[PDB]
Amino acid sequence: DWKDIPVPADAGPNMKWEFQEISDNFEYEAPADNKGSEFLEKWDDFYHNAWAGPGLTEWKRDRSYVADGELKMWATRKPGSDKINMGCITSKTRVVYPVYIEARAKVMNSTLASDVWLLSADDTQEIDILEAYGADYSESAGKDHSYFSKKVHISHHVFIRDPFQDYQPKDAGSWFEDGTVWNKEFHRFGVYWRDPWHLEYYIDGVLVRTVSGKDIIDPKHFTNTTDPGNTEIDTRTGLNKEMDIIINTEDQTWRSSPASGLQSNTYTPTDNELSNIENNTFGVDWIRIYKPVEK
Amino acid sequence: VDWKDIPVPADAGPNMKWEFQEISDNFEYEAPADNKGSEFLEKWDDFYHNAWAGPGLTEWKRDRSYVADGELKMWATRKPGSDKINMGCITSKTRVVYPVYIEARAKVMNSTLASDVWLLSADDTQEIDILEAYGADYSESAGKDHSYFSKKVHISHHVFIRDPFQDYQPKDAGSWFEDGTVWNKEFHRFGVYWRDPWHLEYYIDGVLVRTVSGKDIIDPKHFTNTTDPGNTEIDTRTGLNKEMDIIINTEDQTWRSSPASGLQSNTYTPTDNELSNIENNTFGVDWIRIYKPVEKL
Ligand SMILES: [Mg+2]
Ligand code: NA
Ligand code: NA
Ligand code: NA
Ligand code: NA
């Protein structure tokens, strides 16, 4: 049972993990165009503002649904356009450290991103639990896509919005690779957001990455309460803000319009690829959230 | 025993060790009150962290601090033609931030004035009080025995909203440490491990006397929210995250020289007779040492 599975992070001395009721194993029916009350008590079937998404993405309420024990989400071409309509849902309740959040999900066999992530209300702080481009092959680029099919991006962002700036860790360990082709099975992707300066990523119950300390979380001081981006002044906040849980798929600009201009580095679904619906359906069996509490 | 050889009582953690910071000072130079000189001035400004001249009857003065005989020293005198009291205040020229252990060896004044070693953010919203103590045996202004306070060390922290003004600190009984010691008789060590924005440990003479940990005690009212301060339904609290100036001073505080009650029996501030004893109104700090935890190589 999903609640029998141990949480792999360490709750602390004389602490245990307490299941949060905002968790969801999607064992109800929620038709795409009429979600119903069970879905809507925990989830909104859009992004947390009216932005319809990055690159060719045009998020739609009716591109998410739940059936057969899973949250499901699929992609179709927007008629008369290059855009792709796609699913996006957001939690109605926010989460904050310390918290362990884990999704059992099956990365799409698609060049589109399959995402489970966290985002603060003011869009300045982000934790990416799963961001993965799972296709075996890409017709757009005309190449084997196993460079990406075997990788899971595990990361976090801090932003300045006024003029837009974006930081994330870029070291090699931010892309986890086993030999596992992620699209073949459901896997568990989790994060222990322990405090503003410490993140631990777990895949299938195993610690795969620790992101700890100021130098890697916010070296450019984008989280300064006073004068963001100024490293002479330290009023850094770290990842402190409560966050919405977001599950979506995305066409991202660096993929559909790559900086190089080359078709060979352009990874986005052709119409032929979109005609296979299962390949472009992201499935989440469950998402569970625990908080550490005193024994 | 050497100030740098004394073990730091806070635990650096697994695979960590304590690294002495050069902004520490054992005050083994001369710095005349009215002309401090270059050794003092590389580490310290001989005033508060802005131009504000202090609370209550306080009127801070550059020339009421000095260093001599191995000590930072600071004294109080009545302002000519006034009830106000001229007194010392210095602040560090470099700021500190968690994780950090900061400890002063200091002798609390035998005076109703506050003897203070504390930390304060540049924007005045966040404050950590390592030592705040009112050390007099007796108060001639109140006409009573002052041992209620002479045996207490206030160890605390504040978070503020500037507009409109709101002040939160922990008010439980443990925020005033008392073991029978009369703090004004000897130099003692007063330290804080500011470990992270939600965790403080207070050490006196190398012993853990108090731990202030968690959101419910550090900022239960959400004064450190980044958006909508004071709104407890929204959680963007930062805790004690902001880098801070080190401040060492004495103070006449308003709650003492003009108490809420309006009563002379609750009024604790020096008379002219008491100020005439210079030693009683001289705060001495032998040293202040600052360590940061670093990974062992
Ligand atoms: Mg004694
Ligand atoms: Na397991
Ligand atoms: Na399920
Ligand atoms: Na002295
Ligand atoms: Na000294």
Curated annotation (Swiss-Prot), chain B:
Keywords: Cell outer membrane, Glycosidase, Hydrolase, Lipoprotein, Membrane, Palmitate, Signal. GO terms for biological process: carbohydrate metabolic process. It is a lipid-anchor. It is an enzyme of class 3 (hydrolase). It is found in: Cell outer membrane. One of its GO terms (molecular function) is protein homodimerization activity. Residues 1-296 form the GH16 domain. It catalyses: Hydrolysis of (1->4)-beta-D-galactosidic linkages in agarose, giving the tetramer as the predominant product. Induction: When cells are grown with the low sulfated agar. Changing residue 132 to D: Abolishes beta-agarase activity. GO terms for cellular component: cell outer membrane. The active site is at 127 (nucleophile), 132 (proton donor). Cleaves the beta-1,4-linkages between beta-D-galactose and alpha-L-3,6-anhydro-galactose residues in agarose. Cleaves agarose in a random manner with retention of the anomeric-bond configuration, producing beta-anomers that give rise progressively to alpha-anomers when mutarotation takes place. Also tolerant to hybrid substrates containing C6-sulfate groups at the -4, +1, and +3 positions. Homodimer. This is Beta-agarase B. It comes from Zobellia galactanivorans (strain DSM 12802 / CCUG 47099 / CIP 106680 / NCIMB 13871 / Dsij). The chain holds residues 58 to 353 of 353 of the full protein.
